[PDB]
Amino acid sequence: FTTTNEAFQKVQDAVNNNAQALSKLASELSNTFGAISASIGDIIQRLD
Amino acid sequence: SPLLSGTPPQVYNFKRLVFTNCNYNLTKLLSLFSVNDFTCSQISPAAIASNCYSSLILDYFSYPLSMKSDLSVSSAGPISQFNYKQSFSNPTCLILA
Amino acid sequence: TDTNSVCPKLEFANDTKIASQLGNCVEYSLYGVSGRGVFQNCTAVGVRQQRFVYDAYQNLVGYYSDDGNYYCLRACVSVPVSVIYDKETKTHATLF
Amino acid sequence: IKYYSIIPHSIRSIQSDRKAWAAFYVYKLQPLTFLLDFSVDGYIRRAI
Amino acid sequence: YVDVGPDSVKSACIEVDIQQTFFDKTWPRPIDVSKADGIIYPQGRTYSNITITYQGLFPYQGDHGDMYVYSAGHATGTTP
């Protein structure tokens, strides 16, 4: 088991793909879709 | 203190007070005067009392209650047209006291 | 866009302070930063002069209080809920 | 502010005793995207 | 209007001599991004143990810049 071994890299790649799917959801909540603030509560207090 | 001292200028000659980094208590200023009319655009009048902004601009002038309708962005009256204009893009709260 | 220098004057009697509220989900309004989070004590991290400490994702993770103790900040965590149901017996169970 | 100038300073030292003065370098600031590395102390040790 | 105190009593003022060639000495000091020369810290917030891309006013990498030197005035033993 080493970086050189192709099979070991494939096992790591499968773990990375699962991690990437989870990471996307967490990142999108931080992202703001055309709004003053990502937080729903922060927009409510500052807007009518 | 400048707002509470001396004679306020006319609407065309309105003085400008700009606050960038200070804690503000709008209610305390409102309590000293009596507010006959409170109107706000692009934000709630209640919301303006407790929210944070990069900068706050306050303009103080003597304006009579009788011509309040003339001083509006929607109004085409001369006082809004020539004497004073408030930028539409940034949220603006107008208070008559 | 990112900085709000002017903020409403607010007064803390004593109990409404970060100290003695550690480990409790609480609404925080420190120097114009408003959020709901759990406060903890962690070793001082980041520049002390800048009280707000942010992660790479721009989420507040640490704060420097007037008392001078650095405080770890985390969002309050929800309890996941799932239901086990059998149609034939009309019986239900809850896995938290 | 559209313009700036450097005001020359001369030290009226005795001819026998004089001190060399370090030169100061002025660099213009341009909007740029910089990769910044932050240490545990939080100071930016290196940038790209 | 703030007051800086009294203006100089003497209308006459000291003579100066302009010699750019004397100040024309080359000592190049290019900005190095590796040592983070001339980097303004984000005034909005502090970041710890993270690497991020930040947009801000920054000097060009490898910029020699403009060099200005200050020198002692001409003197004759007791009087400059």
Chain C partners within 8 Å of E44 (Cβ): 2-3, 52
Give the number of C-alpha atoms closer than 13 A to the C-alpha of residue D35, restricted to the C-beta side. 4
Q: Which one of E43, E48, E49 would you mutate to disrupt binding with C, by most C Cβ within 10 Å of its Cβ?
A: E48
Give residues 8 to 47 of B whose Cβ lies within 8 Å of A: 40, 42-44, 47
Burial letters B31-70, b for 16+ CB under 10 A, else e: eeeeeeeeebeebeeebbebbbbeebeeeebebeeeebeb
**Cβ–Cβ under 8 Å, residues B78 and B72:** no
Longest Cα–Cα distance of chain B, Å, equals 36
CA nearest neighbour of E61 among B22, B39, D34: D34
Among candidates B19, B49, B52 on the partner chain, residue whose Cβ is nearest the Cβ of C32: B52
Give the number of C-alpha atoms closer than 13 A to the C-alpha of residue B74, restricted to the C-beta side. 4
What is the C-alpha to C-alpha distance for residues C84 and C42, in angstroms, rounded to an integer? Answer: 40
What is the C-alpha to C-alpha distance for residues B56 and B26, in angstroms, rounded to an integer? Answer: 11
Chain D partners within 8 Å of E63 (Cβ): 27-28
In this complex, does chain D touch chain A, defined as having at least 3 beta-carbon pairs under 8 Å apart?
no
In this complex, does chain E touch chain B, defined as having at least 3 beta-carbon pairs under 8 Å apart?
no
**Residue of chain A whose Cα is closest to the Cα of C57:** A30
Tokens for C83?
């239901």
Q: Show the beta-strand stretches assigned E in chain B.
A: 15-19, 23-24, 37-41, 56-60, 92-96
Separation in Å, CA B14 to CA B80, E5, E38? 13, 33, 43
DSSP code, position B7: P
- Is B24 in contact with C7 (Cβ distance < 8 A)? yes
- Is C47 in contact with D41 (Cβ distance < 8 A)? yes
C44 Cα to chain D: minimum distance (Å): 9
Q: Which residues contact B27 (CB under 8 A, 6 or more apart)?
A: B49
For residue A22, the surrounding DSSP H or E stretch is helix A6-30
What is the C-alpha to C-alpha distance for residues C13 and C11, in angstroms, rounded to an integer? Answer: 6
C70 Cα to chain B: minimum distance (Å): 23
Chain D partners within 8 Å of C45 (Cβ): 40, 42
What is the C-alpha to C-alpha distance for residues B91 and B51, in angstroms, rounded to an integer? Answer: 12
Chain A partners within 8 Å of C37 (Cβ): none
- Is A48 in contact with B50 (Cβ distance < 8 A)? no
For residue B27, the surrounding DSSP H or E stretch is helix B26-32
Tokens for E59?
């000097």
Helix (H, G, I), strand (E, B) or coil at B28: helix
In this complex, does chain C touch chain B, defined as having at least 3 beta-carbon pairs under 8 Å apart?
yes
CA nearest neighbour of C19 among C63, C76, C84: C63
User: What is the side-by-side strand order in the sheet with C33-41?
Assistant: C25-30, C33-41, C70-75, C60-64, C52-54, E46-47
Count CB pairs under 8 A between chains A and B.
Answer: 14
**Residue of chain A whose Cα is closest to the Cα of C34:** A42
Chain A partners within 8 Å of C34 (Cβ): 41-42, 45
- Is C34 in contact with A41 (Cβ distance < 8 A)? yes
What is the C-alpha to C-alpha distance for residues E72 and D15, in angstroms, rounded to an integer? Answer: 9
